[PDB]
Amino acid sequence: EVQLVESGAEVKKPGASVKVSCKVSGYTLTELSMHWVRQAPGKGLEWMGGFDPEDGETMYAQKFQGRVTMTEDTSTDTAYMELSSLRSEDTAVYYCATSTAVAGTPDLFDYYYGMDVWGQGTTVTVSSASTKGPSVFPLAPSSKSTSGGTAALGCLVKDYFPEPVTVSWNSGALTSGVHTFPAVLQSSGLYSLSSVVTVPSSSLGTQTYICNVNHKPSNTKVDKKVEPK
Amino acid sequence: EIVMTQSPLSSPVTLGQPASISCRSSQSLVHSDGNTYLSWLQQRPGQPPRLLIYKISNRFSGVPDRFSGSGAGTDFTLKISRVEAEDVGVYYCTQATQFPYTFGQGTKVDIKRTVAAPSVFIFPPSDEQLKSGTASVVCLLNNFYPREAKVQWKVDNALQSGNSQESVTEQDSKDSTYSLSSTLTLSKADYEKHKVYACEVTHQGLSSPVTKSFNRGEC
Amino acid sequence: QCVNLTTRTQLPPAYTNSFTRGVYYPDKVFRSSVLHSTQDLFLPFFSNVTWFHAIHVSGTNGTKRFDNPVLPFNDGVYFASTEKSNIIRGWIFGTTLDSKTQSLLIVNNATNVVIKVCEFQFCNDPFLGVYYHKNNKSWMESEFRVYSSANNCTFEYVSQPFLMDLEGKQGNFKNLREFVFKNIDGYFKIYSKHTPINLVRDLPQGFSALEPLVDLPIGINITRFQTLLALHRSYLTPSGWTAGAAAYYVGYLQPRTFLLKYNENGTITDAVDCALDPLS
Ligand SMILES: *[C@@H]1O[C@H](CO)[C@@H](O[C@@H]2O[C@H](CO)[C@@H](O[C@@H]3O[C@H](CO)[C@@H](O)[C@H](O)[C@H]3NC(C)=O)[C@H](O)[C@H]2NC(C)=O)[C@H](O)[C@H]1NC(C)=O
Ligand SMILES: *[C@@H]1O[C@H](CO)[C@@H](O[C@@H]2O[C@H](CO)[C@@H](O[C@@H]3O[C@H](CO)[C@@H](O)[C@H](O)[C@H]3NC(C)=O)[C@H](O)[C@H]2NC(C)=O)[C@H](O)[C@H]1NC(C)=O
Ligand SMILES: *[C@@H]1O[C@H](CO)[C@@H](O[C@@H]2O[C@H](CO)[C@@H](O)[C@H](O)[C@H]2NC(C)=O)[C@H](O)[C@H]1NC(C)=O
Ligand SMILES: *[C@@H]1O[C@H](CO)[C@@H](O[C@@H]2O[C@H](CO)[C@@H](O)[C@H](O)[C@H]2NC(C)=O)[C@H](O)[C@H]1NC(C)=O
Ligand SMILES: *[C@@H]1O[C@H](CO)[C@@H](O)[C@H](O)[C@H]1NC(C)=O
Ligand SMILES: *[C@@H]1O[C@H](CO)[C@@H](O)[C@H](O)[C@H]1NC(C)=O
Ligand SMILES: *[C@@H]1O[C@H](CO)[C@@H](O)[C@H](O)[C@H]1NC(C)=O
Secondary structure, X not given: OOEEEOOOOEEEOOXXXXXXXXXXXXXXXXXXXXXXXXXXXXXXXXXXXXXXXXXXXXXXXXXXXXXXXXXXXXXXXXXXXXXXXXXXXXXXXXXXXXXXXXXXXOOOEOOOOOOOEEOOOEEEEEOOOOOOOOOEEOOOOOOOOOOOOOOOEEEEEEOOOOOOOOEOOOOOOOOOOEEOOOOOOOOOOOOEEEEEEOOOOOOOOOOOXXXXXXXXXXXXXXXXXXXXX | OOXXXXXXXXXXXXXXXXXXXXXXXXXXXXXXOOOEOEOOEEEOOOOOEOOOOOOOOOOOOOOOOOEEEEEEOOEXXXXXXXXXXXXXXXXXXXXXXXXXXXXXXXXXXOEOOOOOOOEEEEEOXXXXXXXXXXXXXXXXXXXXXXOOOOEEEEOOOOOOOOOEEEEEOOOOOOOOOOOEEEEEOOOHHHHHOOOEEEEEEOOOOOOOXXXXXXXXXXX | OOOOOOOOOOXXXXXXXXXXXXXXXXXXXXXXXXXXXXXXXXXXXXXXXXXXXXXXXXXXXOOEEOXXXXXXXXXXXXXXXXXOOOOEEEEOOEOOOOOOOOEEEEEOOOOOEEEEEEEEEEOOOOOEEEOOOOOOOOXXXXXXXXXXXXXXXXXXXXXOOXXXXXXXXXXOOOOXXXXXEEXXXXXXXXXXXEEOOOOOOOOOOOOOEEEEEEEOOOOOOOOEEOEEEEEEOOOOOOOOOOOOOOEEEEXXXXXXXXXXXXXXXXXXXXXXXXXXXXXX
């Protein structure tokens, strides 16, 4: 009955500040209590912010105290959260969780706690570096890589911060046996991905395949052919 | 502040059979006015965590009624009965008392797949990776588990470890497997001097280690 | 806002027969024990007062039916309902129930009644919403489910609320409230009464001296009206609205002649209608 709307991605630079927004719809912002929950990547869930239906105050995670503030625009139904002096270890997905402040009717009052609806997340990223294009290395098949029950075929992309991308390995034609990972942040502060799709073996030799390496913030929509080698 | 835990940190269950996740605490979670506050969040991969049995033993709206809460005081337990697909993810058990909340140590479940054999594919550095200033070799191991497995790089046969970062995929839906990759990182001066490149994998699911490679260039 | 709702059900509006109801003081004169006749508008006795069902429950499982349609104002309306829980709040008399014409709105808001005459922009199914505010820690009653915007208002009267309940007798009372609205020559007069009752459902047999509450110098042109319900938010109980169960009786005035009998105290008693039968 409630819908929460997120606020898109935000790449930033260390030392700055960042403000994340969350639009409610279905109920009004003056009867829900917002809690913000980080998701440091490949890890658990961490609490900060929140709201005490009691005392109305808005507690602040000791871990982030004197470092974050939270304000509420009740007119346009959005809540805001401002994290400041961003260190290197704050790249996370930031969830906008909520519940209903009480429970029942106009006759029965239960101050209710918890999180009920979770709103889809935004992805901030601190990085002391800038934005780079591609480094596409088309991983060419092989002798016994192909000619089996299924083949394998991929492209190799290193040292880049274009953020997202896609892969696909074609124009919506390939989708069988492709295994992807969760990129990574090298020690220098760059990424490194391998997307090697186990394609069928019978199709190669008559029609080679292409990785569509499209870097929408870098706008380097390079589409490299991967001739079997 | 509270700081509970979990129990199976996994528990790849079977089809059609019940399952049991066990929570724990380090306080008494009975909030004043006597109602304890547990919840059992279910998070799919790449999605927000939804909700399931909140407030100890209840059910949330639209939860398809296979889920059951139990316990009291300090021990708690979720129990699914006759599981199927569409229940695979992570099951946190948040508390909600003593302001600074805290979540469960996390607990992933999945399908109970037998210890099958992995499959090995290797790939060398493309021709424009040969002049890139830094090349790479991948170890496309297919089908395996991330915890009891083992992926080893054999840069031209010579066991060379310590310079690698690992990326493993999720489980498949048609097969519920587990892809595995590794990123050997060495200098440009080292990557040219060679040819017979191979990746040798040893894992509990394989009788003998695999060994699939590629000859630099050729057809 | 403007969350439409209604369904479709309605069946045939249950009819009934008020025996002798709706005799308002047709002036501001104090009088002794005499016999007074008056040509005015009244509800004719033994009429066919329609019995509308608001939120309507059915023996089987939950099921709530909504059906407070707009009705014709004709020349005057005898409105009555029992309603131990204050779920009727007020009425929205008007012409088009939109902008380009004015509209009268009476809300109760049980600490203070307040009346406005703006160019409102009502939803097609208006009602008051009740929620919780998370500051002031108190269930407020925001009215923006009724109208979108309210501009050009040319009046605003505040006053102790009409629907003052009492009960405090765990039943046997049921407190039948009546109202009669009539609109002539640029005025708006309301007459009221609160009466204890013990009959099962319908109208009793006695006499009610509906004395006037207010008179409003408006001049608005009225030809269609509706009634306001106070629905609250449901919360963690498996739209999220629809309090209680309610019903009210509506019946329209006609110009007739009555022969009212006054007390020695100054109150009416038995009213005789010339027009009912030949004996009358
Ligand atoms: C029943 O209806 C009454 C009429 O609307 C409400 O009474 C008034 O509500 C106002 C806010 O809703 C109060 O504050 C006023 O707000 C306006 C906004 O801009 C100011 O101009 C006014 O100066 C300000 N008034 C004061 C005295 O500060 C009014 O005070 C209040 N009036 C009274 C007599 O209470 C009731 O709130 C409403 N009942 C409920 C339960 O909501
Ligand atoms: C409150 O009621 C008012 C009464 O009608 C409305 O005010 C009217 O707005 C019109 C514009 O929308 C004005 O039109 C002007 O008309 C004169 C002659 O009629 C022309 O010469 C002007 O060019 C024309 N102006 C424009 C900008 O078109 C009306 O004069 C004006 N009425 C009065 C009495 O001033 C308001 O619109 C209404 N409030 C709201 C919020 O709608
Ligand atoms: C009061 O408003 C109504 C409009 O609802 C006027 O009544 C008639 O309305 C119908 C539409 O239902 C029109 O077709 C008629 O032309 C209206 N009657 C007349 C005589 O024009 C009514 O006229 C208005 N009263 C005043 C004094 O303006
Ligand atoms: C109004 O009429 C009633 C009864 O006809 C009178 O009210 C009674 O007044 C006496 C005072 O001597 C009380 O003991 C009774 O209990 C009253 N009864 C009721 C039902 O009120 C009254 O005298 C009349 N006159 C007035 C109120 O001016
Ligand atoms: C319901 O209300 C909407 C406007 O909110 C309107 O567009 C729609 O036609 C209405 N349907 C019915 C059956 O009333
Ligand atoms: C009231 O009106 C209905 C219309 O269906 C009619 O059947 C009934 O006889 C009427 N009753 C009286 C008392 O006029
Ligand atoms: C109620 O809320 C209003 C503003 O919404 C505020 O001015 C007023 O002081 C509050 N009253 C209490 C008792 O909290």
